[PDB]
């Protein structure tokens, strides 16, 4: 019903650009399969590419203006250059001088367009091949947090200055500044839920990978074939965890667990970040009203000073 060959080679707009496949070699010896092969370009594929190339061009040219078009200095201070959103004056106004904050707005707009078109590409290419569309919905879950950071949170605060600034060290600075601004960002409870889910996600990943590699000898890696008929490998993998921690899951459930942990991470993160600027101005002062701050009447500060 579905021809894979006509879906691997089909000219342009409806086909792949890099028709000849290639071999990486060292990837083959350590990563399993090691062929690069063709990459499909569609209608949605060309749009995200050109919009991302526009935003990156806008940002890269504006770096050069800051250094005076000096390539020696440009290469030296590349990692601490950035472009910043408008200041608190003219908070939401769109008419700002190019050098002060005007370059940031166009770049962020083209970045948004590229992201949404990439989502559409994911969805359409998933439907075309006959497989389900779960990856697209997960990407949407991550886009929720992405859009809260850059669009929804600066809006509803009145300032475009709340968003980050398109720099390598600028993002660390943004994290630090927001946490300091709200005050004791550790106390935010949805931040606690997000950390719980993130560390659970890393836990699950390491465990699933490790057990599957250990039981590889019996061809337990092919998770699709095992779903119809469980071989000796899957039978051993269940028994190992049953004796250690008292319960276990087959090959179908464990991937549900993985998916849901990874998605809850980003959803709880977005919900928790949105509330910081609007409902609860100070998080630590809120925690002492919820009776969850350690009393610490007199600490031993000799440790912290040198």
């Amino acid at each position: 019903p579905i021809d894979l060959h006509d879906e691997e080679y089909r000219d342009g707009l409806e086909g792949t650009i890099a028709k000849p496949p290639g071999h990486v070699g060292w990837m083959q010896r350590l990563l399993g399969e090691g062929q690069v092969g063709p990459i499909y370009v569609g209608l949605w594929g060309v749009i995200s590419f050109i919009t991302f190339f526009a935003s990156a061009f806008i940002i890269l040219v504006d770096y050069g203006r800051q250094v005076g078009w000096n390539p020696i200095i440009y290469l030296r201070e590349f990692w601490n250059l950035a472009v910043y959103p408008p200041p608190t004056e003219y908070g939401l106004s769109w008419n700002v001088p190019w050098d002060k904050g005007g370059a940031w707005l166009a770049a962020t707009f083209f970045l948004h367009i590229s992201v949404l078109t990439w989502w559409a590409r994911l969805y359409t290419r998933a439907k075309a091949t006959g497989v389900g569309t779960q990856l697209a919905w997960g990407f949407a879950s991550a886009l929720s947090l992405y859009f809260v950071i850059y669009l929804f949170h600066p809006l509803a605060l009145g300032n475009w200055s709340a968003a980050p600034g398109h720099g390598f060290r600028a993002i660390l600075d943004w994290t630090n500044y927001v946490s300091i601004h709200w005050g004791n960002f550790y106390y935010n409870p949805f931040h606690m839920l997000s950390i719980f889910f993130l560390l659970g996600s890393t836990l699950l990943l390491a465990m699933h990978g490790a057990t599957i590699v250990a039981t590889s000898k019996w061809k337990s890696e092919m998770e699709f074939t095992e779903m119809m008929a469980e071989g000796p490998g899957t039978q051993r993998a269940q028994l190992f965890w049953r004796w250690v921690m008292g319960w276990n899951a087959n090959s179908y459930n464990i991937h549900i667990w993985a998916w849901w942990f990874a998605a809850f991470t980003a959803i709880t993160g977005a919900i928790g970040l949105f509330l910081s600027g609007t409902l609860v101005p100070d998080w630590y002062a809120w925690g002492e009203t919820a009776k969850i701050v350690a009393p610490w009447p007199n600490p031993d500060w000799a440790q912290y000073v040198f």
């Binding site: 949805f190 019996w218 008929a229 000796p232 039978q235 319960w247 276990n248 899951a249 667990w257 009776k291």
Partner: protein
């Protein structure tokens, strides 16, 4: 004065109750379906 304010409950005890309940229910259901009876390959042959 002795009691945690409102929104202490909503913000901190929706997580602390809901997450523990969710884990204890989801584990029951996954382990049930896993230890249930369905198609497998024989231990005496495949291994």
């Amino acid at each position: 004065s002795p009691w945690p304010v409102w929104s202490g409950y909503a913000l901190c005890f929706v997580p602390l109750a809901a997450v523990i309940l969710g884990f204890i229910i989801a584990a029951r259901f996954t382990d049930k379906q896993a230890t249930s009876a369905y198609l497998r390959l024989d231990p005496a042959k495949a291994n």
